[PDB]
Design a protein around this ligand. Structure first.
Ligand code: ZN
Ligand code: ZN
Ligand code: ZN
Ligand code: ZN
Ligand code: ZN
Lengths: 85, 78
């Protein structure tokens, strides 16, 4: 849903909602989405989660699946934390 | 570039796989690589769904193949 070419801020807005919509996720900041080559899209982000609701390793698996299966993102780096920076 | 001989060995090297035929590997000009194949397996040794998962992982993680169609069968085609 980010399409070919430079991702728009309104497509990133929908990507933010998708990540914030995952059970256990409380927060989201320092989102980076860019294209290195034609087609390939990379993502880095900080994710704030409730450790009482979801396990870190489990949440990481759920986010990787969403980013890969929906957005076709192979190359991602996600910092999971219990409180925002 | 993919070595098909080495790809065949990799698939035949998976525990439970007894046979391999009708292998198709081709590239569209965007670079994306597709694969179709018939895979003969021993149902006493491995579960179909489990084997399918193992083959998809190999094709994705080693060969960067997203687009694949694999026919799992307990005996080879005539
Ligand atoms: Zn940043
Ligand atoms: Zn992939
Ligand atoms: Zn942070
Ligand atoms: Zn054929
Ligand atoms: Zn066959």
């Amino acid at each position: 849903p980010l399409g070919s070419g430079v991702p728009k801020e309104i497509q990133l807005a929908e990507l933010r909602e998708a990540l914030l919509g995952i059970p256990g996720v409380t927060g989201l900041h320092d989102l980076h989405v860019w294209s290195i080559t034609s087609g390939k899209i990379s993502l880095t982000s900080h994710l704030v989660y409730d450790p009482a609701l979801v396990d870190a390793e489990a949440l990481l698996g759920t986010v990787k699946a969403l980013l890969h299966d929906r957005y076709e993102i192979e190359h991602s780096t996600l910092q999971l934390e219990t409180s925002a920076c």
